[PDB]
Design a protein around this ligand. Sequence first.
Ligand SMILES: CCN1CCC(Nc2ccc3c(c2)/C(=C(\c2ccccc2)c2nc4cc(OC)ccc4[nH]2)C(=O)N3)CC1
Length: 261
Amino acid sequence: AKEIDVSYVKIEEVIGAGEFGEVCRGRLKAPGKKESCVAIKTLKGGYTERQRREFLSEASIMGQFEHPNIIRLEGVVTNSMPVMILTEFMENGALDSFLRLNDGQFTVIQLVGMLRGIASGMRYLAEMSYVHRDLAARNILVNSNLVCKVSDFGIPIRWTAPEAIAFRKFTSASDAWSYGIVMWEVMSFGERPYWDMSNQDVINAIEQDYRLPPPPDCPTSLHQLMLDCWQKDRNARPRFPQVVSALDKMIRNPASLKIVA
Ligand SMILES: CCN1CCC(Nc2ccc3c(c2)/C(=C(\c2ccccc2)c2nc4cc(OC)ccc4[nH]2)C(=O)N3)CC1
């Protein structure tokens, strides 16, 4: 629905590499509108015709959404080559590597505001009956004001709920499990979940009631919220409306974030 003329894009600088090509920063400018900043995903010569429709599957599903915590589709370039998806440019890049860079350097309140934006984007996706399946801190992007936005549209054992591993039943409740792992990643400044362990070590521990402990300095009520998301029984996990309001309660009552083991 958003076919964009190729003379309207100036590619400026490579900034990353997604699974099927380079990712660049750039400028978009169409007649009658302001110039804006965009990220540009490309797919260069040499690919199948179902590989092309899977690249562009990202843009079709992404053009469905409109929410301040979901990355925006500016448009596509298909009628020519190279093929392109244009999205919103995100100054502080991926969330896990942004926090490792900034380790120990943001307040609990700021970290909670990140998690509340991600939960809000999750709450909106669940309301539209879209199940993400790949929620992880590496698929959340951060802009100049620290606003967090879910990307990656279109299995990661340690982010995935038990019943989704065993039976391939992927729901919003299994996304809630993945969300609790994102809480842990955020509160541990981008440490890798289950550090040392292998995928089968992780699965064996979970089935045997092991759960990631609180990160150093982590409020007790954030950890409980993680443990609520990690219940074996998928129907006892909080849904995302409940998650966002638990976090809102923390932000209005910041004396509850001072208490720790
Ligand atoms: C498998 C992981 N997923 C994560 C999201 C990727 N898609 C995507 C959509 C829109 C984007 C970026 C990346 C984006 C990036 C970025 C590019 C590639 C990987 C991860 C992030 C970006 N990286 C940056 C690094 C920077 O230096 C620290 C500054 C701004 C950056 N923006 C950016 O600004 N806007 C597809 C791959």
